[PDB]
Amino acid sequence: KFGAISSVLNDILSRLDPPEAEVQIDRLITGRLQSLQTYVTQQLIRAA
Amino acid sequence: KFGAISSVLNDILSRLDPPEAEVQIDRLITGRLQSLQTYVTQQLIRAA
Amino acid sequence: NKVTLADAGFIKQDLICAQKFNGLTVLPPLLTDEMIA
Amino acid sequence: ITRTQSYTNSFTRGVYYPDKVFRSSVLHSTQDLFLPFFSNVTWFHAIHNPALPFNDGVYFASTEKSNIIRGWIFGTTLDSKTQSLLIVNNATNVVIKVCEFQFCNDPFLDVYSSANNCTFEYVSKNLREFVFKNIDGYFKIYSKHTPILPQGFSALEPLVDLPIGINITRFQTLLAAYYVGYLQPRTFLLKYNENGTITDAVDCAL
Amino acid sequence: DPLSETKCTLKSFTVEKGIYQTSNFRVQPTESIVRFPNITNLCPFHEVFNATTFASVYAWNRKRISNCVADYSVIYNFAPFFAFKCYGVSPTKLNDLCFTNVYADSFVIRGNEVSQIAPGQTGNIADYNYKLPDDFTGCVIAWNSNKLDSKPSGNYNYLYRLFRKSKLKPFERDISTEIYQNCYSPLQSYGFRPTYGVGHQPYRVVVLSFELLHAPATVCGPKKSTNLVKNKCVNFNFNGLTGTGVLTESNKKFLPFQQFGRDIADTTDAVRDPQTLEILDITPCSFGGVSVITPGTNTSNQVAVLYQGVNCTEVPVAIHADQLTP
Amino acid sequence: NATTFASVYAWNRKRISNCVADYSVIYNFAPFFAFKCYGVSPTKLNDL
Numbered sequence: 001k002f003g004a005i006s007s008v009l010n011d012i013l014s015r016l017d018p019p020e021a022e023v024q025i026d027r028l029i030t031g032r033l034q035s036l037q038t039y040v041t042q043q044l045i046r047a048a
Numbered sequence: 049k050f051g052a053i054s055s056v057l058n059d060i061l062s063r064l065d066p067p068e069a070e071v072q073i074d075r076l077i078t079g080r081l082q083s084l085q086t087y088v089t090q091q092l093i094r095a096a
Numbered sequence: 097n098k099v100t101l102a103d104a105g106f107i108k109q110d111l112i113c114a115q116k117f118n119g120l121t122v123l124p125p126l127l128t129d130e131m132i133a
Numbered sequence: 134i135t136r137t138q139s140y141t142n143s144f145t146r147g148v149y150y151p152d153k154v155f156r157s158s159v160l161h162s163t164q165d166l167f168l169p170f171f172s173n174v175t176w177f178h179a180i181h182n183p184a185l186p187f188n189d190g191v192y193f194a195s196t197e198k199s200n201i202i203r204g205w206i207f208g209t210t211l212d213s214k215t216q217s218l219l220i221v222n223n224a225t226n227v228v229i230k231v232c233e234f235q236f237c238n239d240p241f242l243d244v245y246s247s248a249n250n251c252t253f254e255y256v257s258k259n260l261r262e263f264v265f266k267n268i269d270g271y272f273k274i275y276s277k278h279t280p281i282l283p284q285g286f287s288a289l290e291p292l293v294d295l296p297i298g299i300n301i302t303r304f305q306t307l308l309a310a311y312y313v314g315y316l317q318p319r320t321f322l323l324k325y326n327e328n329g330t331i332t333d334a335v336d337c338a339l
Numbered sequence: 340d341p342l343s344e345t346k347c348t349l350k351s352f353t354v355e356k357g358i359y360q361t362s363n364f365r366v367q368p369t370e371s372i373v374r375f376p377n378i379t380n381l382c383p384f385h386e387v388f389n390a391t392t393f394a395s396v397y398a399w400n401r402k403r404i405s406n407c408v409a410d411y412s413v414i415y416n417f418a419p420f421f422a423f424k425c426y427g428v429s430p431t432k433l434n435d436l437c438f439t440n441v442y443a444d445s446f447v448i449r450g451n452e453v454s455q456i457a458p459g460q461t462g463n464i465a466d467y468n469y470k471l472p473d474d475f476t477g478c479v480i481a482w483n484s485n486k487l488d489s490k491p492s493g494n495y496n497y498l499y500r501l502f503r504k505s506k507l508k509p510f511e512r513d514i515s516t517e518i519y520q521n522c523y524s525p526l527q528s529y530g531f532r533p534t535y536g537v538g539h540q541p542y543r544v545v546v547l548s549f550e551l552l553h554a555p556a557t558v559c560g561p562k563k564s565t566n567l568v569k570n571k572c573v574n575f576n577f578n579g580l581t582g583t584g585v586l587t588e589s590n591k592k593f594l595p596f597q598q599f600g601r602d603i604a605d606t607t608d609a610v611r612d613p614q615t616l617e618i619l620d621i622t623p624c625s626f627g628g629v630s631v632i633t634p635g636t637n638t639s640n641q642v643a644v645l646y647q648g649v650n651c652t653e654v655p656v657a658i659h660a661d662q663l664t665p
Numbered sequence: 666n667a668t669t670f671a672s673v674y675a676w677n678r679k680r681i682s683n684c685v686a687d688y689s690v691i692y693n694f695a696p697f698f699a700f701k702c703y704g705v706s707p708t709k710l711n712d713l
């Protein structure tokens with residue numbers, strides 16, 4: 001969840017108005033971006 | 049923008065009071081730091 | 097002649113101007129080409 | 134009173150500046166309502182005739198010696214209820230009104246029988262190229278005159294954006310040969326040369 | 340002295356032999372300038388907030404404001420409201436900004452419908468009468484008018500649209516009276532009486548909307564311009580664009596509808612003076628890095644200084660304490 | 666629209682189920698000013 005109400009975009013969109021949906025969605029965006037970045041860094045280190 | 053109102057600090061300082069300007073500036077600070085960190089990590093991996 | 101660089105970080109009294117104006121700089125090597133030759 | 138139509142092709146035509154910002158010697162990616170490259174445009178000849186549709190903005194081209202073509206009307210029903218936009222220009226001075234006009238079928242200028250609730254007033258070969266848009270209550274115009282269908286590029290600059298607050302789904306001309314094309318939302322890659330003028334463009338989804 | 344700066348950077352009282360990258364030097368600005376268009380007439384806010392009659396919500400009244408000096412602090416003298424409600428800007432900075440032109444939309448609604456005058460809302464008022472963009476910049480003002488728009492018998496002069504085939508779009512209106520398609524009239528009138536509750540009493544609403552300076556500005560705050568200085572590191576303020584740097588005459592070609600120019604990083608590089616209409620290039624003031632060379636405090640306290648990537652003839656020479664960062 | 670309301674130490678609880686709920690009609694029953702909702706937004710209440 002990364003501090004958001006839910007881990008599903010559709011529920012956040014169907015339960016809140018857009019102004020609050022945006023602030024709820026940015027947190028998921030940041031968390032998933034961090035996950036991808038960590039994965040890629042580990043992959044590079046292994047490839048070396 | 050990293051979810052902030054704008055990408056220029058001067059505009060944020062001009063349009064908002066300090067209590068909200070700090071909130072808007074924190075996001076820019078975090079984004080810039082993340083960019084620098086990824087750059088430095090990649091530089092290390094190439095130097096190896 | 098075959099290999100072309102961008103800059104060796106000499107005096108700078110484009111793209112390099114933008115890099116400089118945002119605090120990114122390049123330092124020169126300790127040994128010049130003549131010494132390696 | 135009578136009109137006939139053929140169909141032709143556009144050779145990378147109808148590009149306009151999307152912002153009032155000076156740039157030079159760069160490539161910029163933008164997204165907006167543009168005329169897709171290699172479209173299938175319509176060519177109308179008018180001889181002495183329903184209301185053309187207005188899907189979303191329109192591109193208009195004409196090659197006339199004088200003020201043979203005078204203006205336009207925009208609306209949905211145009212009869213008595215829906216407020217309609219009327220723009221009439223003769224000598225570079227344009228009168229624009231937003232009134233419950235009663236437009237006579239097959240209108241021409243020597244247009245409407247009566248008007249109500251205008252609440253608005255505004256007074257202000259060669260290829261005439263025009264681009265018309267209507268988004269969020271803003272009716273916006275871009276225009277250009279090019280000395281010369283042809284090839285190459287010629288950017289269009291912005292005249293005025295006005296608040297009307299009406300829904301427009303049909304438009305008609307009051308004045309003769311002209312070309313009509315329709316815009317769609319998409320992404321473009323524009324090239325700015327030394328003198329901040331667009332020289333080349335790439336359609337990102339062609 | 341530079342040795343003390345090195346000690347502080349290393350967080351120790353002892354420094355060994357070597358060359359340490361200590362800090363960065365910059366040149367400070369000398370004076371400040373302000374440039375605004377020359378305008379005298381004031382904006383007509385008195386006719387908006389002190390009108391004898393307010394339009395119905397279904398046919399809201401719009402007024403365009405341009406080419407005037409805007410002083411917002413006077414608005415508090417006309418209507419007995421409590422506070423602004425501003426989106427995208429704070430009410431205390433409205434006197435420090437320049438806008439292209441302003442729009443004032445006035446109407447009357449019921450007490451509990453005032454919450455529908457914000458972005459991203461739904462309901463009859465926000466669906467069929469008055470809609471606002473999701474990304475809105477402006478301010479909303481609402482105040483009670485129970486002693487003006489209420490009658491003991493009942494006031495039926497204010498109407499709102501109940502049924503409509505489809506929802507409206509931002510800043511769109513329709514004033515037709517066609518019978519809705521078991522056939523119901525589309526418009527219905529508020530029954531306003533003085534004895535109703537707080538949430539059932541009339542409220543007058545005025546909405547101000549601005550344009551965020553993407554073109555020459557015709558409405559600005561009550562600020563005074565200064566003289567123009569070109570070839571010195573100064574603080575400048577062009578129609579709300581604040582910055583620090585050196586101004587110079589420019590040879591760039593600006594089309595009459597272009598006001599400034601941006602860089603690859605969306606950094607302003609050229610501006611058009613609001614008064615003389617000339618093009619000025621902007622550059623940052625001098626900056627560089629300094630390194631301290633020492634033989635070790637265990638041996639001596641003599642140090643040398645390297646200014647990195649600068650010409651010796653162009654090294655800073657100002658001796659005033661308010662011209663360099665070190 | 667109850668003619669009398671209970672005291673705080675004995676608050677009155679009513680259960681609602683098996684019915685179609687339309688939350689836009691309760692603005693006509695009391696002269697209040699706005700809701701105060703946690704976890705949802707009033708404007709979405711008819712979509713759940």
Ligand SMILES: *[C@@H]1O[C@H](CO)[C@@H](O)[C@H](O)[C@H]1NC(C)=O
Pocket residue numbers: 140141173
């Ligand atoms: C263009 O549209 C006309 C309309 O009927 C159609 O006949 C034609 O095949 C289309 N394409 C070309 C290249 O004309």
Ligand SMILES: *[C@@H]1O[C@H](CO)[C@@H](O)[C@H](O)[C@H]1NC(C)=O
Pocket residue numbers: 326327328
């Ligand atoms: C810009 O304009 C000048 C003057 O007309 C001209 O000499 C120059 O060639 C132009 N730049 C380009 C890239 O054509």
Ligand SMILES: *[C@@H]1O[C@H](CO)[C@@H](O)[C@H](O)[C@H]1NC(C)=O
Pocket residue numbers: 389416417418
């Ligand atoms: C509003 O205008 C009327 C008419 O001149 C005037 O009597 C009244 O004092 C004005 N209200 C305020 C608050 O100035």
Ligand SMILES: *[C@@H]1O[C@H](CO)[C@@H](O)[C@H](O)[C@H]1NC(C)=O
Pocket residue numbers: 375376377378613614615
């Ligand atoms: C005042 O008007 C504009 C600036 O707003 C500009 O023409 C100049 O500064 C003044 N006009 C003159 C000097 O004629």
Ligand SMILES: *[C@@H]1O[C@H](CO)[C@@H](O)[C@H](O)[C@H]1NC(C)=O
Pocket residue numbers: 107650651652
């Ligand atoms: C420093 O500036 C002077 C001024 O002409 C120039 O002659 C000199 O070459 C510059 N320094 C270097 C290292 O080029």
Ligand SMILES: *[C@@H]1O[C@H](CO)[C@@H](O)[C@H](O)[C@H]1NC(C)=O
Pocket residue numbers: 666
């Ligand atoms: C609901 O409350 C009103 C008070 O405004 C009252 O007149 C009415 O009788 C109530 N409803 C019923 C069914 O009694």
